[PDB]
Design a protein around this ligand. Structure first.
Ligand SMILES: */C=C/C1=C(C)C(=O)N/C1=C\C1=NC(=C\c2[nH]c(/C=C3\NC(=O)C(C=C)=C3C)c(C)c2CCC(=O)O)/C(CCC(=O)O)=C1C
Ligand SMILES: */C=C/C1=C(C)C(=O)N/C1=C\C1=NC(=C\c2[nH]c(/C=C3\NC(=O)C(C=C)=C3C)c(C)c2CCC(=O)O)/C(CCC(=O)O)=C1C
Lengths: 455, 473
């Protein structure tokens, strides 16, 4: 039921800032009940006097911003257009550092040097007590991979977390609204009145609201963890939530707007910088690589036909990919090399192969989670790779697999849930095989590219 | 073409607008700008061997000592208590140090246009945005952006200039105007500013690396003296103040932000600090728009691909099938005609040349450069006798279907277009070497060229084979 809470229409905001919803050919309609007080539906040309309405409205009408109360203070004006009406949020009220951190983020050589640099700067620009960089694995559980922190605050590096610490609907949001901050986690929520879209006749969609009332479930989270000031930035490699810059603080802390814009730009930089390294390991490997591969190709290219060619040098080509066993799978011809799974090799994997192929391949570390009955066969089938020969179908799919490996994984303790406390706790992990990056995959691809020459 | 020979990293001099120091590990300053006599009282032969701190403030002394600790600019050199600007680096094995004379509103202007380049939907909407922003912040009379071609010749593809400033837009430039070595370092030294071009260079004394047997490598120098030829160049062009930024898409010199000014003009560190970022942000978008278009070409190739799947499912000869779909799929990639070359069967669909298509193009095909393709925009160039059929075969694109023997070949043909390109020059008219005196645009109209294939159009053909294969199962 975790992916079921509707967080985007919460009908409230946070007390520190105040916001207004207006009718677009500008008159103002639906009000946040955080701002009527220290300053109901109303006509919009009716804001500070023409200085901050008019010039700021025309810039909003045609194509950030800086903004007369009884109390006479000064606010920050951020906005956006969404579900067809005009939003406007208000919160209370250097350059070298930013560029030099790009300049350092550009020279960083390894994926760790990229992140601990990323982690480094956005702490030095929010002062936050802890700035962790959080990569998602495929199952979208995570691991804090690098970390930069003030002393005396507990350290969470190399630490795995449930996928559940941020649920499914929460994640589209961070895939589309790329940044979020709550300064005090014990803010008493101040409602929006009404929560009626006057336009679409239903609750106030508060999606690109950065003042939005947040989940009490994740409020429960930070009174647990004991950090009362928190912000994050999501990391987007091609519309996919790759990971998160999760910032923390023992005490509440506000980061002002142009101060929060810099934080994000860093993540964007890492979003190529990672993509830089994603691709130069992708060609550092195809080289060594060719030297030995091309050899046992000409040894499989002793093709009067292939099995006497391949399986003669398969005991060599098996050693390439951690091939505990493999299988050839044509609908008619299934050929095993090495250690064999028998019947749901054919139907429960090839149908499993190209369906939701998505034109990309299928690889998995776990099978008892992707096909439940693989649990009995973990000793030879705990993890599986498969490459289509391509149309859906005949879709003749080749596949290599891996046995299970007993690794010990650390956790913010007991992933067994409501949660309570997150001290270090070990789980021995069964039914899991050891992974793949493309010095095996790009080998595997450059296997069947090479094979397909069997014309 | 000695152009590519002149050693430019060791001019033996720096520029007057600042002063430079060369120091070893323990701050024995080795060489110095010959205007340093006017700075501490000592003529240069006396600076030599002296220590750093004495030259300096007690404040500024320590603040460099810490910056050097980390195994990167900018400190301030208030040294005695006026304020200087400290850009440094290690190079050779010694630590260089260059010196320069003396928030928010600057920086809103940055993201306002950082996030502008993020929105840009075309290159030209992006580069009249890059060039626009560079100009808003370095106030240069003219801000051009320069595209490098395959030969390292170039083209002004966008431009922003204040009115009154004569325009070099859409103009081509020879590959000689930036010779080999300049590029070799513009790849690695991404920035250069020369603020006056009739400046009298301040030499460094000595011109010796004490570290090794060399003159002084002024590679990472912002202050290094440039070639006199490139100066006679810009007296000719009529712009007496210039700055360039290198636009690097992944360690290949892609192009250049070349700013110009009628009179001299200076850009402080911050000014061109933000500007190094603009070419950075821009080298990014170029790669996004590049690859975001590979997805919308992969888009419209959908409906008409589905066409020839149903046409090989029905006919099960792909030739019969695809060559029926021929009328459209060779418009998809704007090809004139194509041909399918199986070493056994050559079937020529639409417009195509005869018997030298076979061997003189499939033995030219891929050279067993397995990861490689083949193409041209002129074929009369490479098979000279193809000049005869240059009317139907001027450019070509051609995909293998295997490691040679089997050598299956698909190939797309494009005809000859009379396109008009123009430049300053006289690209043949390019004792010492000497730079051109006139830069008025001459037009040339080109014999035997196809339209430029893009990865845009290439990604099309690329997908075709990768489905023919899918089907053949
Ligand atoms: C299934 C419900 C949840 C469980 C269990 C849980 O632990 N949290 C749950 C719900 C939400 N989390 C929301 C935001 C959020 N969660 C995290 C989790 C982390 N913080 C960290 O510091 C680290 C790792 C170092 C993790 C994994 C983060 C970072 C965020 C974003 C905000 C922040 O910076 O803390 C969330 C959304 C609330 C809302 O937007 O209304 C929910 C519902
Ligand atoms: C055969 C010798 C040379 C001829 C002729 C010539 O024109 N240049 C020759 C050698 C060098 N050129 C150097 C630098 C340089 N050249 C250019 C060329 C252009 N500038 C433009 O604005 C445009 C078009 C709009 C072109 C085609 C540039 C940009 C530069 C760099 C400096 C700048 O921004 O003006 C050069 C290097 C000198 C040095 O810096 O050491 C040499 C040797």
């Amino acid at each position: 039921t975790c992916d079921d809470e509707p967080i985007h229409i919460p009908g409230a905001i946070q007390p520190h800032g105040l916001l207004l919803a207006l009718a677009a050919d500008m008159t103002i309609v639906a009000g946040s009940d955080n701002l009527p007080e220290l300053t109901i539906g109303r006509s919009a040309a009716d804001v500070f006097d023409s200085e901050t309405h008019n010039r700021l409205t025309i810039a909003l009408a045609e194509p950030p911003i800086a903004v007369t109360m009884r109390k006479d203070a000064g606010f920050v004006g951020s906005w956006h257009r969404h579900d067809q009406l005009v939003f406007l949020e208000l919160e209370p009220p250097f350059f070298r550092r930013t560029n030099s951190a790009i300049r350092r983020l550009q020279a960083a050589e390894t994926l760790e040097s990229a992140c601990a640099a990323a982690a480094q700067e956005v702490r030095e620009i929010t002062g936050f007590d802890r700035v962790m960089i959080y990569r998602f694995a495929s199952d979208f559980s995570g691991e804090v991979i690098a970390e930069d922190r003030c002393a005396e605050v507990e350290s969470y590096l190399g630490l795995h977390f449930p996928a559940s610490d941020i649920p499914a609907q929460a994640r589209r949001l961070y895939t589309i609204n790329p940044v979020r901050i709550i300064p005090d986690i014990n803010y008493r929520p101040v409602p929006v009145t009404p929560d009626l879209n006057p336009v679409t006749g239903r609750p106030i969609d508060l999606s690109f609201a950065i003042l939005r009332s947040v989940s009490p479930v994740h409020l429960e989270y930070m009174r647990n963890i004991g950090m009362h000031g928190t912000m994050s930035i999501s990391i987007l490699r091609g519309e996919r939530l790759w990971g998160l810059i999760a910032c923390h603080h023992r005490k509440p802390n506000y980061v002002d707007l142009d101060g929060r814009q810099a934080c994000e730009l860093v993540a964007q930089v890492l979003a190529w910088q990672i993509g830089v390294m994603e691709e130069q390991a992708i060609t550092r490997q195809t080289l060594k690589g060719q030297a030995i591969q091309r050899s046992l190709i000409n040894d499989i290219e002793q093709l009067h036909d292939h099995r006497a060619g391949l399986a003669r040098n398969s005991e060599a080509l098996l050693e390439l990919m951690g091939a505990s066993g493999l299988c050839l799978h044509s609908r008619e011809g299934v050929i095993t090399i090495g250690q064999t799974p028998p019947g749901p090799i054919i139907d429960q994997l090839a149908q499993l192969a190209g369906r939701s192929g998505g034109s990309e391949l299928f690889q998995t570390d776990r099978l008892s989670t992707i096909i439940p009955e693989a649990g009995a066969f973990a000793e030879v089938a705990s993890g599986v790779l498969a490459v289509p020969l391509s149309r859906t179908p005949p879709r003749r799919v080749m596949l290599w697999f891996r046995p299970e490996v007993a690794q010990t994984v650390y956790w913010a303790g007991n992933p067994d849930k409501s949660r309570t406390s997150f001290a270090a706790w070990t789980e021995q992990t069964h039914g899991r095989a050891i992974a793949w990056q493309p010095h095996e995959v790009a080998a595997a691809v450059e296997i069947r590219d090479l094979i397909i020459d069997v014309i």
